[PDB]
């Protein structure tokens, strides 16, 4: 059955304008397709969730730098 | 200027059907008006964020109980 | 997991996405109508909601 | 010391009817940006590279 979860999902309503410091990032995820806007969230060392636009090259490069491939 | 923040916001897409055990809840918040659905999130002691319908009696009662705790 | 619903969709499902529906077992602690969607999702909904009580008839008028 | 730059851009296009004016932030700013002013006088940052942003401006210009 669905919704597989009654748990909340992180959604984004703005996109950070300039790349945040790569060293401040520890993890990333793509937001749920249920959200109104497509986004990538970067999780900082202090556990903040910064929203970014999936189409941006820097966002994709940071993802590459966080993935083992 | 707006957006005032680049951080994500927790949104809800389904509402838990049966009341959660009151003892398992430690905090609550209403989700952002930017989300598509209005909702209350109850934070459990295991830190799960469970979505609930703001219009239900048990939900408003649990909120009042938390506020007085 | 279970054959029983634990939560109800917060917003009505667009009518065109619905292919079929069924009720869960009367044994389940929560009463529910499940909609089978175009993309084969099984969505739990509150049988009390006005939109549910019209998406069903809309699927059973014949 | 009177903040006037955009640190983030709105993600979803603003309702065209809600916007009455626009301006670009200064070259002093770390990021280039368009600020749309809504009829309730909210000032919202947007990405100048986006099609909807460029279209709103072109529309705002003609009238």
A7 half-sphere exposure, CB direction, 13 A CA radius: 11
Contacts 24+ apart (CB under 8 A), D49-58: D50/D13, D52/D13, D53/D13, D56/D13, D56/D14, D56/D16, D56/D19, D56/D22, D57/D22
Question: What resolution in Å is listed for this PDB structure?
Answer: 1.7
What radius of gyration do chain C's Cα atoms show? 11
- Residues of B within 8 A of A6 (CB-CB) are 14-17, 50-51
CB-based contact C6 B13, cutoff 8 Å: no
Chain A residue nearest residue B10, CA to CA: A10
Please tell me which of the candidates A1, A5, A6 has its beta carbon nearest to residue C34. Answer: A1
The torsion region of residue A47 among left (phi > 0), alpha (psi -120 to 50) and beta comes to: left
Dist CA C52 CA C5 (whole Å): 15
Chain B residue nearest residue D4, CA to CA: B1
- Residues of D within 8 A of A51 (CB-CB) are 8, 11
CATH tag for A1-69 (out of 2.40.37.10, 3.40.190.10, 2.40.50.40, 3.30.559.10):
2.40.50.40
As its CATH architecture, domain D1-63 has Beta Barrel (2.40)
CB-based contact D12 A16, cutoff 8 Å: no
Best mutation site among B2, B5, B6, B50 for testing chain A: the one with the most A CBs within 10 Å?
Answer: B6
- Residues of C within 8 A of A3 (CB-CB) are 7, 9, 43-44
Chain B residue nearest residue A53, CA to CA: B6
Cβ contact C29:C4 at 8 Å: yes
Burial group, residue C47, by CB count within 10 angstroms (0-12, 13-18, 19+):
middle
A vs C contact (3+ beta-carbon pairs below 8 A): yes
List, in sequence order, every beta strand (DSSP E) within chain B: 9-11, 14-16, 25-30, 40-44, 49-52
The SS3 assignment for B4 reads: coil
- Residues of C within 8 A of A33 (CB-CB) are none
Maximum distance among all Cα pairs of chain C, rounded to whole angstroms: 34
Specify the experimental method.
Answer: X-ray
Tally C-beta pairs within 8 A across B and D: 19
How is chain A split into domains, by residue range? Answer: 1-69
Burial group, residue B40, by CB count within 10 angstroms (0-12, 13-18, 19+):
buried
Nearest Cα of chain C lies from the Cα of A7 at a distance, in angstroms, of: 10
List, in sequence order, every beta strand (DSSP E) within A17-68: 25-30, 40-44, 49-52
Q: What DSSP letter does each residue of D31-49 carry, written as one string?
A: S--EEEEETT--EEEE-TT
Dist CA B15 CA C3 (whole Å): 17
For residue B7, give both structure tokens.
């951080």
Dist CA D2 CA D29 (whole Å): 12
User: Which fold is adopted by the domain C1-62?
Assistant: OB fold (Dihydrolipoamide Acetyltransferase, E2P) (2.40.50)
Contacts of D14 (CB under 8 A, 6+ apart): D36, D38, D44, D46, D56
Which of A18, A23, A27, C46 is closest to A10 using CA atoms? A27
- Residues of B within 8 A of D45 (CB-CB) are 1-3
Q: What is the dihedral of CA C47, C51, C56, C57, to 10 degrees?
A: 130
Chains touching chain B through at least 3 C-beta pairs below 8 angstroms are: A, C, D
């Amino acid at each position: 059955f669905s919704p597989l979860s009654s748990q909340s999902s992180a959604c984004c309503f703005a996109y950070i304008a300039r790349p945040l410091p790569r060293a401040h990032i520890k993890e990333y995820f793509y937001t749920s397709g249920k959200c109104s806007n497509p986004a990538v969230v970067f999780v900082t060392r202090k556990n903040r969730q910064v929203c970014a636009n999936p189409e941006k090259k820097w966002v994709r490069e940071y993802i590459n730098s966080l993935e083992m491939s």
